[PDB]
Design a protein around this nucleic acid. Sequence first.
RNA 1: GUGUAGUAUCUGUUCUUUUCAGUGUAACAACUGAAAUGACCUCGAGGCUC
RNA 2: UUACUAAGUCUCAUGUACUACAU
Lengths: 444, 188, 25
Amino acid sequence: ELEPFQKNFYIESETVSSMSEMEVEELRLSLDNIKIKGTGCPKPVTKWSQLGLSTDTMVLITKLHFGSLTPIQSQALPAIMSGRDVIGISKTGSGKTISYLLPLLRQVKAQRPLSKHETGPMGLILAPTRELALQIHEEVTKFTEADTSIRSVCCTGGSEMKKQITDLKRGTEIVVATPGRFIDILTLNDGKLLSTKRITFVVMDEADRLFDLGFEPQITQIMKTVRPDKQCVLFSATFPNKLRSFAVRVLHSPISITINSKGMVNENVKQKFRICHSEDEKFDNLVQLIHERSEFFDAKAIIFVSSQNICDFISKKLLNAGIVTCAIHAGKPYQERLMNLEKFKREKNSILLCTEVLSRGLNVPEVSLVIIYNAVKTFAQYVHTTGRTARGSRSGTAITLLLHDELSGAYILSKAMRDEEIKALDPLQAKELQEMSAKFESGM
Amino acid sequence: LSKGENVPYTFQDEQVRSNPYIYKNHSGKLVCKLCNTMHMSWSSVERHLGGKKHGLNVLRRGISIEKXXXXXXXXXXXXXXXXGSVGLAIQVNYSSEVKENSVDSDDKAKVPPLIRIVSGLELSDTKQKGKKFLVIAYEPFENIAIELPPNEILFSENNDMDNNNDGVDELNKKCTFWDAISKLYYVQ
Amino acid sequence: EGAEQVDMPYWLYKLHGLDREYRCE
RNA sequence: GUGUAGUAUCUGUUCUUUUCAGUGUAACAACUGAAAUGACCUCGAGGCUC
RNA sequence: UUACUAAGUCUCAUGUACUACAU
């Protein structure tokens, strides 16, 4: 008859809870393309203060972690603090450790102390190597140092067992261990020196490595002696089939968090840009682009603009210059939208001229060329506009006509383009891009 | 796995080797001359090299590779008393720029007089003994002594607050003063 | 005040017989 | 030039509950049982310690 | 001038032989 306990310690800050869904999508794209799976994921935070940690802890952390929250921290901290099981896929050095330590500290702190007959622990962190266990435990101590109500003992192989037994004699709220040693300690002396009965929180870090180094049997047996309503988080740089299979076995309604696994834009889309200095030059490029394309002759294009007034203007402009377009926007009667869409889907080598906001929902097949005439200002809009050309192997090209003053636009391009896409273009255009993006970035 | 290196046989009578250790004996097997261990494949050889065994033998092989004018001044003894017991105080006077005018070459000139407690167990004559002397010495002038029958007087207990400039000893810093401007040495 | 800065044979030693400290009298 | 079951032998790797008592052993090893918690002193060692 | 002795157990891999059994 299990003892009930609290796992959700998260109070969403007002500023975060005010965020809309579109805002949250955008924040995830900007944070190195965070991808989530699972139901009910809390919104990412962007500041240590949105987590409701005491001043002590705040001072301590800062001290402990210098600079901005990492993408993994932004998303994993509120999900774990909320008591959810979590799969966190991110590289070593992404700061993942505090992502689980803070919530673990909080959870263990809240539980009643160990009785005079209870060994502990309440929290268990498993690592595949002695070197990682020691590193994790060093972190832990930087927190248990201030607070004498909480101990951690590090239990690994390649190290005296008797030494660690002397520790565990005194009871311990937290254990950091390699799987073999832990199992060895559990079974030792009728399992009377270490109990699993009070473990409510298990973390497995570098989880892919645990299978690599043969620990499936040990970690599987450990999870079998742990209450199944425990909170469990699995952190790993990769997600091999073995881990995927293990998570299904040990987790409930997990939230998976993957940082920039793949590109925000399909890698088969060829992203390009041209930096211009007047609307006129932008228009000169747009025309050169439309003619040039013909020498490579389905093959259709879509010019995206930012407003209905711009769409009308550019439509007339392009007309006066011998180029006929199928123009579309929400200020036009639906009947003529349909006429233009059908004309576009009908006529060979047609050109659609469309507002960026209608891009996600356009009912047309993928195209060979997207010309973004007004650099978009969000990551979400960039994905929807460029995605109009995405088509696995048959993906075409998306090109942005950017103006010298469009700093945020350059920030988006610098974040969504592949490095090798920026290399193949003129090194001065490239250099301006990076300068534009850096200026925007320090602008905040 | 051999990386294209040629390991000559042991009997070929030794081109520099990467490791001048792993050889091939009269037979085809590979051996570590130090470790005297046989290895079937080059992979086993690399396990041997990456193993602690071979390393220990390497360290053992490295260990094998390494293998006075004498002028009596004037003292002024006087029975003192403070609180809570009784102590002695001596006032020793020195020359009045009479002879020290010929020697001023900063040769320990900055060094003040020094005192030490000597047991009479050792004397130039060695006749009688059994008491202590509070000897006081200065470079040019002659040494001076004062008999101390009482086993202990004025032997205080942490007078100052434990500051560590030993000078010569606890005795000197603890209870001496050197009026160098007037040439008067006080001791108590 | 004044602290200014500027600018292995585990089973082998048991087997050897050191499970029980021996003594020469 | 194959497959089923199974065996032996290298080498790599590593040191399993600090102690006590019994079995066991040539002595080990190994096996069998239990378990301190707290305080202090000098350079992991030490206590007619409580 | 260095007065002559080291591997063992476990674990998880590699090296190499082998024994019944079937095409």
